Design an enzyme around this catalytic site. Structure first.
Site, short mmCIF file in Angstrom:
data_model
loop_
_atom_site.label_atom_id
_atom_site.label_comp_id
_atom_site.label_asym_id
_atom_site.label_seq_id
_atom_site.Cartn_x
_atom_site.Cartn_y
_atom_site.Cartn_z
CG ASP A 9 -49.32 99.50 8.10
OD1 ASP A 9 -49.03 98.35 7.73
OD2 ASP A 9 -50.45 99.80 8.54
CG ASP A 104 -47.72 95.01 7.68
OD1 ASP A 104 -48.11 95.12 8.87
OD2 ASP A 104 -48.37 95.50 6.72
CD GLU A 105 -49.01 97.64 12.28
OE1 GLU A 105 -49.78 97.23 11.39
OE2 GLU A 105 -49.38 98.41 13.17
MG LIG Z 1 -50.20 96.84 6.27
MG LIG Z 2 -49.76 96.60 9.47
#
Ligand SMILES: [Mg+2]
Ligand SMILES: [Mg+2]
EC number: 2.7.7.7
Length: 342
Positions: A9, A104-105
């Site tokens: 993350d 983003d993860e």
């Molecule tokens: Mg994040």
């Molecule tokens: Mg995230």
DNA sequence: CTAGGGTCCTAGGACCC
DNA sequence: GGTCCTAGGACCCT
């Protein structure tokens, strides 16, 4: 039969990207979000702004009351997408068992990996280091035997850290874990659960599955399972997009159909451009519209339709405008497409 | 003082049986 | 008794 699952993350993703590309923003409070005049909200903020209480989803007027010097940025989505593609390619160096959850993860199942002596801890560390080395952005990570615990764990040592939960550690970890920390248990559920003495996973463990099922349906089975560390969901690298939408909130409410139709004329070219990236022939399953009123009720009406069509969307918006609505002002207009199944 | 991008679940009537 | 159509809502991400 214990799996190794990593949740990776990125830290303050959008803001971290803006600070890398403009070091002047590194130590002042910044945030990506629409202006107060655009009736915007914060997408995210850096740690200098979070210190003042600035948070994702906060109305930008409130962000500015807490943090009067907040520097507001519009967002560079191609820059975020580029960094997203880069970290996913970095994930691919370690396994193909990758399930991205957002730009983003991602989840990674490294159970059958033999990088780093099969150590999920050191894989996660190497991934975070490589991301920093190659993108000059930091990431945090969580390591656990199932998805949801890994995702919880990636929050606990951020920024630029990681946390590992072993099977031996799961029961102590769960006992006082607040239910709201489980992905998918939100404000509304937590308040219902709180309202009858269920705050933590330990509280739910003392509960009967049959009662949880009666009272939350299939969600109550999820609650029962997660409260015991049970999470059999497999990392799925084959998920595909199902819809695409384009909507705009106006700075002032609109009250006239002419105004609504004008908004739609601006939205439609954008919807077509984005559909065309993924479906050049524009063939789809359904299309529809969205209105949000000044009292924040929202309505959608959508229907089977074979191919993106501006006039039908205008026509449908007209009906919604006339039929539902009842004299309210309109703060948002949206267009929507449901993608074909394969 | 309340975004814009989405996923998933529920639920009633229609339709097919 | 399944499955499709449709609307609404909780929830997720930044
Ligand atoms: Mg994040
Ligand atoms: Mg995230």
């Amino acid at each position: 039969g214990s799996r190794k699952i990593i949740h990776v993350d990125m830290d303050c993703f959008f803001a971290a990207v803006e600070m890398r590309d403009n070091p002047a923003l590194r130590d002042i409070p910044i945030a990506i979000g629409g202006s107060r005049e655009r009736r915007g909200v914060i997408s995210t903020a850096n740690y200098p702004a979070r210190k003042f209480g600035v948070r994702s989803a906060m109305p930008t007027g409130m962000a500015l009351k807490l943090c009067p010097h907040l520097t507001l940025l519009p967002g560079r989505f191609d820059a975020y997408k580029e960094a997203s593609n880069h970290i996913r390619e970095i994930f691919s160096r370690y396994t193909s068992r990758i399930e991205p959850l957002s730009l983003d993860e991602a989840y990674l199942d490294v159970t059958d990996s033999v990088h780093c002596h099969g150590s999920a801890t050191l894989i996660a560390q190497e991934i975070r280091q490589t991301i920093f080395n190659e993108l000059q952005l930091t990431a945090s990570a969580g390591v656990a035997p199932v998805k949801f615990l890994a995702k919880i764990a990636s929050d606990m040592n951020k920024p630029n850290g990681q946390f590992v939960i072993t099977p031996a550690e799961v029961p102590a970890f769960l006992q006082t874990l607040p239910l709201a920390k489980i992905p998918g248990v939100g404000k509304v559920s937590a308040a219902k659960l709180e309202a009858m003495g269920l705050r933590t996973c330990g509280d739910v463990q003392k509960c009967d599955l049959v009662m949880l099922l009666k009272r939350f349906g299939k969600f109550g089975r999820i609650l029962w399972e997660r409260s015991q560390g049970i999470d059999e969901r497999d990392v799925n690298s084959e998920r595909l997009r199902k819809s695409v939408g384009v909507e705009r909130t106006m700075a002032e409410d609109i009250h006239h159909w002419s105004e609504c139709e004008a908004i739609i004329e601006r939205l439609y070219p954008e919807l077509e451009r984005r559909l065309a990236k993924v479906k050049p022939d524009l063939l789809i399953a359904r299309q529809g519209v969205k209105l949000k009123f000044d009292d924040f009720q929202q309505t959608t009406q959508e229907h089977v339709w074979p191919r993106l069509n501006k006039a039908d969307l205008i026509a449908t918006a007209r009906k919604t405008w006339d039929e539902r609505r009842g004299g309210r002002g309109v703060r948002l207009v949206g267009l929507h497409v449901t993608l074909l199944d394969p």
